[PDB]
Write a protein that binds this ligand. Structure first.
Ligand SMILES: Nc1ncnc2c1ncn2[C@@H]1O[C@H](CO)[C@@H](O)[C@H]1O
Lengths: 355, 320, 9
């Protein structure tokens, strides 16, 4: 018919005949991502394949959630949907879902490792914050930003790939050998506290500090050891913070070995930053000042997305059409709250694919 | 005038346990350190070693007399920490040495809550095997199944849901009068002291419907004789209301509260006189029911007998 | 200043 199959390694991609010359570009928790040439659009696209998402309740929840958001969210700094199809003809035969999205050049692992100047470092962080603020205007808190799900293009544009974890999603998604999620997990999530919208700035602080140090800031050996790596660097938090913790978590945190931490001048010395740009705001001290406001254990004392966009290191590139863009209207008011059975998820996802 | 001083090795033992130095802990215990050394926050060495997860030294502390159910200033027992951090090995040895499975902290959390919050399935099984309250509510009225749902641990959610359903069937089996079903659900592990949304236990429903055989079976399996519903009614209240003599006498033999009152102040003797069960009134008086008991309105059992026109019962109450 | 227009690899 109008479909054809191509063997990509061990995965089998049954894509539309319009998508030719499929080539692998990355491996994720949901499956393999391929780059193709859309002969109809005469442009390069990216295709990822979801295999029986409904069969897993958590994957069904994410697949539907991300299908809904991918459609209605249109923004310069969030990856854009181009097509959605399934090769199966009926609801009973329904199996796989293919998402066609804008094709980017690489992920942040190539940019974090290379040596950047202040102009590109701040502009990439600005593009990140614009995407985060747009997601927040729709009521989505990402809580899962890491170099692996942030992609860039050779013209220095940045886009967020996924929409993170919901409130009920948990600490992590399915397995992948190319990512360690706990490194960028925020203290609120670690210690079982509630999380606010500024939880995403902790991820940004870890990513920004990684652009400067060229190594993982907080490399925990296990889930609860991640807290040790955080306090060893930033210092044991104040008693004001620990009072908000649940009893058992508080008992653990109180009886941890006390660490005084290091000042951000010792954590991020001037030598680790590039030469001070010709712009007055793009100084090594300004980038360190932004880090001192993001990498903060107490979310109550951490700055917000709007405050970071007004920070002198970021405010250089402020454009209201990018930061104060009109928020997207999500059609499903119970996007994250709905619970269904495996066959109810199957029919719910199938309808999103077909219209 | 007299100035006492102490060697205070417990502070050194607390630090050696917090740092996870097992050789120093053994050396300090061998030099006289108290295994129950308390911090200003109430932390004992058993707390700190449970956090580090050193099973060998946990058992040495327990063998030397450490309080297995010590709680700190926020009410955290070592079992809370072991359930929070996922130390199955320490959870089992703590329960082996007599830990409280339903130990509760400042915010009403049991160890089953913490295992459900952080997705330690095997610990949930061990906690439930040792008799954890499946429907234990906290400061916010959330059961462990609710917290498993809130943290996305579906497998623990589905595990606790089937355990709640089994308790739900035991309740209806006791109400309907199916003795074989009641005994079957007890063998499968259903908590004999489970409660519904308004506080009725299986013993409440069995006494209400007059299922004496099931009342005896539940009591033989360790049911709470004086469990309260939200209104404050014990099984003896409902038994006195129905006028079922055989159940009233069985409840009293197993230690029922003859003078228990509800939110209004109504005692089993009030109900027996209210509904004209002279035979029940005599037995309640035989077990020492208070005749002068007043409700919120100042009505004694004699008053309610006079109000409802039970002339025979009011005479018995008058002589007492 | 003007936004950067190139990012190598
Ligand atoms: N639209 C996409 N464009 C470019 N690369 C992608 C895309 N989606 C996924 N990838 C690659 O796969 C990884 C995770 O799927 C990313 O880190 C990236 O390397």
């Amino acid at each position: 018919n109008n479909f054809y199959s191509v063997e990509i390694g061990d995965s089998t991609f049954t894509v539309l005949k319009r998508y030719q010359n499929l080539k692998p570009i990355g491996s994720g928790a949901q499956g393999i991502v391929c780059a193709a040439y859309d002969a109809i659009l005469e442009r390069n696209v990216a295709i990822k394949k979801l295999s029986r998402p409904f069969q897993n309740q958590t994957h069904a929840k994410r697949a539907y959630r991300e299908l809904v958001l991918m459609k209605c969210v249109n923004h310069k700094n969030i990856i854009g949907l181009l097509n959605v199809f399934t090769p199966q003809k009926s609801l009973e035969e329904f199996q796989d879902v293919y998402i066609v999205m804008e094709l980017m050049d690489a992920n942040l692992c190539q940019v974090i490792q290379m040596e950047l100047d202040h102009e590109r470092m701040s502009y990439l962080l600005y593009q990140m914050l614009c995407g985060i603020k747009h997601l927040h205007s729709a009521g989505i808190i990402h809580r899962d930003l890491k170099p692996s799900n942030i992609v860039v293009k050779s013209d220095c544009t940045l886009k967020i790939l996924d929409f993170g974890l919901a409130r009920t999603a948990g600490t992590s998604f399915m397995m992948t050998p190319y990512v360690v999620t706990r490194y960028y997990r925020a203290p609120e999530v670690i210690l079982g506290m509630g999380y606010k919208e500024n939880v995403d700035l902790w991820s940004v602080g870890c990513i920004m500090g990684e652009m400067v140090c060229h190594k993982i800031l907080f490399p925990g050996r296990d889930y609860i050891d991640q807290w040790n790596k955080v306090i060893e660097q930033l210092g044991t938090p104040c008693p004001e913070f620990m009072k908000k913790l649940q009893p058992t978590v508080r008992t653990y945190v109180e009886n941890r070995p006390k660490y005084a931490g290091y000042s951000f001048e010792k954590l991020f010395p001037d030598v680790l930053f590039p030469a001070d740009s010709e712009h007055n705001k793009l100084k090594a001290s300004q980038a360190r000042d932004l880090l001192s406001k993001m990498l903060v254990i107490d979310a109550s004392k951490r700055i917000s997305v709007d405050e970071a966009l007004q920070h002198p290191y970021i405010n250089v590139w402020y454009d209201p059409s990018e930061a104060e863009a009109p928020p997207p209207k999500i059609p499903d008011k119970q996007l994250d709250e709905r619970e269904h059975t495996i066959e109810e998820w199957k029919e719910l996802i199938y309808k999103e694919v077909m219209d | 005038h007299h100035h006492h001083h102490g060697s205070d090795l417990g502070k050194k033992l607390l630090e050696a346990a917090r740092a996870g130095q097992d050789d120093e802990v053994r050396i300090l215990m061998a030099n006289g350190a108290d295994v129950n050394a308390s911090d200003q926050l109430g932390i004992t060495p058993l707390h700190l070693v449970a956090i580090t997860g050193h099973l060998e030294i946990v058992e040495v502390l327990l063998k030397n007399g450490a309080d297995v159910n010590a709680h700190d200033f926020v009410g955290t027992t070592p079992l809370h920490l072991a359930a929070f951090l996922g130390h199955l090995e320490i959870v089992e040895v703590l329960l082996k040495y007599g830990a409280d499975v339903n130990a509760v902290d400042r915010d009403g959390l049991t160890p089953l809550h913490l295992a459900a919050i952080h997705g330690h399935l095997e610990i949930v099984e061990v906690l439930l095997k040792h008799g954890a309250l499946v429907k234990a509510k906290d400061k916010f009225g959330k059961t462990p199944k609710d917290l498993a749902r809130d943290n996305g641990n579906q497998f623990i959610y589905e595990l606790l849901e089937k355990a709640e359903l089994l308790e739900k069937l035991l309740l209806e089996a006791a109400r309907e009068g199916h003795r074989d079903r009641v005994e079957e659900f007890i063998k499968r592990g259903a908590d004999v002291n489970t409660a519904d949304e308004t506080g009725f236990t299986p013993l409440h429903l069995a006494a209400w419907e007059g299922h004496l055989g099931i009342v005896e079976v539940l009591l033989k399996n360790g049911a709470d004789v004086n469990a309260n519903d939200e209104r404050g009614h014990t099984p003896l209240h409902l038994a006195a209301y129905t006028g079922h003599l055989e159940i009233v006498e069985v409840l009293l033999k197993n230690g029922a509260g003859v003078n228990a009152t509800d939110v209004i102040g109504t005692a089993p003797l009030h109900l027996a006189a209210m509904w004209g069960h002279l035979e029940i009134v005599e037995v309640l008086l035989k077990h020492g029911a208070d005749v002068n008991a007043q409700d919120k309105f100042g009505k004694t059992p004699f008053d309610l007998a006079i109000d409802n026109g039970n002339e025979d019962i009011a005479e018995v109450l008058q002589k007492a | 200043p003007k936004r950067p227009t190139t990012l190598n690899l």
